[PDB]
Design a protein around this ligand. Structure first.
Ligand SMILES: O=c1[nH]c2ccccc2c2nccn12
Ligand SMILES: [Mg+2]
Ligand SMILES: [Zn+2]
Length: 313
């Protein structure tokens, strides 16, 4: 009960910032995550022995893929920690608990392929889940690990709190399906602007939690330029592998996923920042003003990609 986690001074300070990079030392990531739970949630939320066993089973069920890996899980959990810490009183005990676990679990057992490639391949997961295929699988994997013996970190909750937290986590994980982002942000935009947004309306809270999940999941675009640029290589390493597997099925991949069209990467980043990232953080900042630093950093990185095309780097 009296066992705190402490980070070194640089990490203790930089971890509160949105643009924090968790570093190349895999063995520190579990401790970084426990640190964030204790400060975000309390040292009482979870039984440390159960939490540590949950975390190491989650780590084990992420694959060695270039991007959709254990490092991404923890990066996304840190972005959610930063949002929750900058919006202290807006979220319930249950929500703070649920959302950090949802982030850690959001991409469990990812293979580095889009929902589209699973459909074109005719993967068994595509027969069992027709939409948000991987996302329904990630939530399924989460429930499996929670049911391993000694792994039920939620065991002190009541029957009803337990169903609530697993509903928060299910919705949170489904919302990381980017195909659902576009309609969700558009509805939030309308509700903010026509002034009907209501945080006490649970259908509204769900949408706002969904946008936070998209914001955390894309948070590679909100880092300092050198982190953003190097993470983009891992992202495109998966896109090009999927493109290779599309060509093997007898289908030209879209140019973003074709490794013969690397030249077109900078313009593909522009489209993605304008079409997805900037609108995501704009709406998020309108609803939760203390998340403005994510919008500022995203803008800085858009400007950095424009410089890449003007040959300035
Ligand atoms: O160019 C990019 N950059 C990204 C950066 C972070 C997360 C998703 C993406 C992405 N999805 C499609 C294209 N994309
Ligand atoms: Mg995902
Ligand atoms: Zn993700």
């Amino acid at each position: 009960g009296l066992m705190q986690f402490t980070l070194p001074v640089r990490l203790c300070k930089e971890i509160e910032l949105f643009h924090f990079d968790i570093g190349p030392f895999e063995n520190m990531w579990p401790g970084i995550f426990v640190y964030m739970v204790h400060r975000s949630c309390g040292t009482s939320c979870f039984e440390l022995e159960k939490l540590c066993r949950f975390i190491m089973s989650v780590k084990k069920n992420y694959r060695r893929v270039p991007y959709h890996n254990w490092k991404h899980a923890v990066t996304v959990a840190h972005c959610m920690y930063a949002i929750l810490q900058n919006n202290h009183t807006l979220f319930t005990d249950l929500e703070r608990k649920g959302l950090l676990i949802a982030c850690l679990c959001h991409d469990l057992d990812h293979r580095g392929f889009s929902n589209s490639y699973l459909q074109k391949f005719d993967h068994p997961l595509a027969a069992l889940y027709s939409t948000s295929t991987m996302e329904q699988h990630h939530f399924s994997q989460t429930v499996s690990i929670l049911q391993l013996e000694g792994h039920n970190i939620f065991s002190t909750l009541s029957s009803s709190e337990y169903e609530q937290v697993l509903e928060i986590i299910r919705k949170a994980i489904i919302a990381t399906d980017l195909a659902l982002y576009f309609g969700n942000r558009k509805q939030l935009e309308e509700m903010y602007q026509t002034g009907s947004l209501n945080l006490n309306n649970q259908s509204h809270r769900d949408r706002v939690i969904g946008l936070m999940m998209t914001a955390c999941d894309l948070c590679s675009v909100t880092k300092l330029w050198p982190v953003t640029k190097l993470t983009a290589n891992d992202i495109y390493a998966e896109f090009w592998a999927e493109g290779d597997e599309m060509k093997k099925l007898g289908i030209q991949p879209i140019p973003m996923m074709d490794r013969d069209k690397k030249d077109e990467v900078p313009q593909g980043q522009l489209g993605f920042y304008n079409a997805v990232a900037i609108p995501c953080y704009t709406t998020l900042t309108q609803i939760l003003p203390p998340t403005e630093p994510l919008l500022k950093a995203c803008r800085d990185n858009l400007s950095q990609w424009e410089k890449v095309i003007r040959g300035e780097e």
